[PDB]
Design a protein around this nucleic acid. Structure first.
Lengths: 141, 174, 52, 79, 199
RNA sequence: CAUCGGUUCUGGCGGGGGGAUAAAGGCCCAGGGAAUGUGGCUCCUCCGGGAGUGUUAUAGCCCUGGGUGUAAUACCCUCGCCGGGACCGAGGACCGCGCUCUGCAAGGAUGCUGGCGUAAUGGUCACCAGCGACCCGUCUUGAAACACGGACCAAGGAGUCAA
């Protein structure tokens, strides 16, 4: 963040209740800051006002968590892409499942982690292997 | 370092969109088994190039058998080893019948003479001395001598350890 | 009342796997490979094998 | 020294448990102090390591120099 | 009977297919990289004393709560990281068909209502895994070996194997990596000799 | 003792597969090469042997390619078969899964035989032998040590009752 003028698209983001947003405190504007802690934290919008939003964070105290409701201005909040990977996945999976049910053939419905690679053939034509010593001979020179 | 075998290990970096055909790297590694051979391959390849096991693959592992194990040969081994001072070169030679036997004898000899373990010895080159004048160390220059005939004085006879008592004093002349 | 090893008791083996008798009779553990003259190894493979 | 005819008091090699524990603790503290002095050391350390080189007693050092020759020539021609 | 005949034929065809592909690649002047192993057999070889909480939790999630307990694990990054963390306590590798069938024949126990019931009949497997198509001991071995769609259900139905100590013993220094001269870590296809000694 | 079941130790035999379809190696074929130079020739000699010469001769060796050859063997993996030994016999009509289906090695040991019928087995006590084994409480502190109590025995002896 450079010194000077705040970019104006901060004011053009539309905020609704239930949205997942993070708190990035802008040092330029002093009004509407949260505490020092609750900076860089992500929470749920529960109340939207004319120029600020209410965010639900869960602080930890001793051996338990306490719900906290904070009123932070739109200048210090930013939309969070934490559930972007969920919304894109649910739309893609919904339309793919509809298409698969229409076609008849079932498809993979769950994301799969990194499976081991299958067998394949590597040709040595024009890619003949070079022999390496434990130390490079140019380095020994 | 055990019953050693020599392995051709060819590996490469994983193919990406930028490099569809990465270069193949081949090494000759003396290891007891294929797991140790591939581990030493990844160690030496991490020492030279930007390839590690998580970003590369082992293309081939092949046992390199000796062409003539029944022919007595002289081998020159050029190696580097780690001491408390640092890295040092040694060139040594061994009169054996195979490269793996020469390397095993080298490992035993370096352990005996300089207390260097498998972790601190790098095998840089193993060559066959095709001619007699390539022999430089006196202990094999004395073995390649013309008409090498010697006796075996003071040979203790091989007596079974379970036979505790003998009735005559053994002779050491056979 | 007693667990019996199928690898020692043949009756339990034939109870769990009816194909064990057919396997032993047809000698499916001693199947010979397919016949045919094997082509020799290319010389380039041996050159790469014995390349110093 | 008249050691054979009149030996002196023998030096015991049998270790004391207290002594071994103290020596182990002192060794651990020396390792820690050496780590601290290595982290705070201002003496210069070269990133590159000096190459030990090729021994003169190696009989095919000529031949090694040759494939180094056409290797660097082929690299320069390809580059 | 017909299913077991099909499975034996399938095993023979897969082995001959791998050998044939390797030979054809070698003859055309290339290298056939075999497929990475999809199945490992993990044996806990260290005790339950003085263990950090994260490896302890991973060893409980792998159902390795006793020394000389073995489980079948499908290879994926998610389990591979876990096995990497618990490497100082376990030895793992790639089992073969003989190892799998001998393990499930001799030390095959299923979990029925939270109870360890020996696999002395195909009927028990038929009630507890017939909804996935596994109705016999040969089909259970096939699913475990080939890592089918119901590998999770088969492996969870199988109780953790309680192996004996190896015949012939371990290496002289056991709690050390197999590459270094010990027994911990991935020994790859050398797990079969350990399974013969322990089972 | 025989026939079995469970667990386990150990020995041998018959096969199958893989790799450079092991690598070698033997017997042939076609080339090339050298010395720790064979025969021959020459020169010295104590004539016992050395020195020089050159590529097989009156020995041989190495390197390359081909045939036998899909040779054998080593190593690894695997399918079975046959012995030798130890420990154990839980349950007590049938039911079940099965198979080689008149029956069975199939949801746990029976059949035959011998000596004795009593201190023979077994048990208790005393002693010897092998191995193991610091004196109990309390207190301290994180603990030990120190410190405190203990000559022995019998009886008495310390969280009770009311609100």
């Amino acid at each position: 963040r450079k010194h000077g003028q705040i970019p104006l698209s901060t004011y053009l983001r539309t905020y609704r209740v239930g949205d997942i947003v993070d708190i990035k405190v802008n040092g330029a504007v002093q009004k509407g800051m949260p505490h020092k802690f609750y900076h860089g934290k992500t929470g749920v919008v529960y109340n939207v006002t004319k120029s600020a939003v209410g965010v639900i964070v869960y602080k930890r105290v001793k051996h338990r968590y306490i719900e906290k409701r904070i009123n932070v201005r739109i200048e210090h909040v930013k939309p969070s892409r934490s559930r972007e990977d969920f919304l894109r996945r649910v739309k893609e999976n919904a339309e793919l499942k509809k298409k698969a049910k229409a076609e008849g053939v079932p498809v993979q419905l769950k994301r799969q982690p990194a499976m081991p690679r299958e067998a394949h053939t590597v040709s040595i034509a024009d890619n003949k292997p070079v022999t390496l010593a434990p130390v490079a001979y140019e380095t020994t020179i | 370092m055990g019953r050693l075998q020599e392995y051709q290990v060819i590996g490469r970096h994983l193919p990406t969109e930028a490099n569809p055909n990465p270069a193949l790297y081949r090494m000759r590694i003396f290891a007891p088994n294929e797991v140790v051979a591939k581990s030493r391959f990844w160690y030496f390849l991490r020492g030279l190039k930007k390839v590690k096991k998580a970003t590369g693959e082992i293309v081939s592992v092949n046992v390199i058998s000796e062409k003539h194990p029944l022919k007595v040969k002289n081998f020159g081994i050029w190696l580097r080893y780690d001491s408390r001072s640092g890295t040092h070169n040694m060139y040594k030679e061994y009169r054996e019948t195979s490269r793996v036997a020469a390397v095993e004898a080298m490992y035993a000899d370096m352990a005996a003479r300089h207390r260097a373990r498998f972790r601190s010895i790098h095998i840089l080159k193993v060559v066959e001395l095709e001619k007699t004048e390539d022999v430089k160390r006196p202990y094999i220059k004395q073995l390649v001598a013309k008409n090498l005939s010697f006796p075996l004085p003071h040979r203790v006879p091989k007596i079974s350890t379970k036979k505790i008592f003998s009735a005559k004093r053994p002779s050491t002349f056979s | 009342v007693q667990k019996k090893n199928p690898l020692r008791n043949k009756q339990i083996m034939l109870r769990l796997n009816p194909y064990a008798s057919t396997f032993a009779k047809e000698k499916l553990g001693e199947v010979k490979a397919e016949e045919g003259k094997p082509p020799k190894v290319p010389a380039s493979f041996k050159e790469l094998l014995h390349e110093a | 020294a008249g050691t054979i005819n009149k030996p002196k008091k023998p030096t015991s090699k049998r270790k004391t448990t207290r002594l071994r524990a103290k020596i182990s603790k002192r060794a651990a503290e020396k390792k820690r102090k050496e780590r601290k002095l290595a982290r705070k050391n201002p003496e210069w350390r070269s990133k590159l390591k000096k190459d030990p080189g090729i021994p003169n007693l190696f009989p095919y050092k000529e031949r090694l120099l040759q494939q180094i020759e056409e290797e660097r020539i082929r690299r320069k021609e390809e580059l | 009977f017909k299913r077991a005949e099909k499975y034996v034929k399938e095993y023979r065809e897969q082995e001959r297919e791998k050998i044939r592909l390797a030979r054809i690649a070698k003859q055309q002047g290339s290298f056939h990289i075999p497929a990475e192993a999809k199945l490992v057999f993990v044996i806990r070889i260290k005790g339950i004393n003085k263990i950090p909480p994260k490896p302890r939790k991973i060893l409980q999630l792998l159902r390795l709560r006793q020394i000389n307990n073995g489980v079948f694990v499908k290879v994926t990054k998610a389990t591979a990281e876990m096995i990497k963390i618990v490497e100082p306590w376990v030895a793992y590798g790639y089992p073969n068909l003989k190892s799998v069938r001998e393990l499930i024949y001799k030390r095959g126990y299923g979990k029925v209502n939270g109870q360890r019931i020996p696999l002395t009949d195909n009927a028990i497997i038929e009630e507890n895994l017939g909804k996935y198509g596994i109705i016999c001991i040969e089909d259970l071995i096939h699913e475990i070996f080939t890592v089918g769609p119901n590998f999770k259900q088969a492996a969870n139905f199988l109780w953790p194997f309680k192996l004996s100590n190896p015949n012939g013993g371990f290496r002289p220094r056991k709690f050390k990596h197999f590459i270094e001269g010990g027994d911990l870590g991935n020994r790859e296809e050398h797990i079969n000799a350990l399974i013969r000694a322990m089972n």
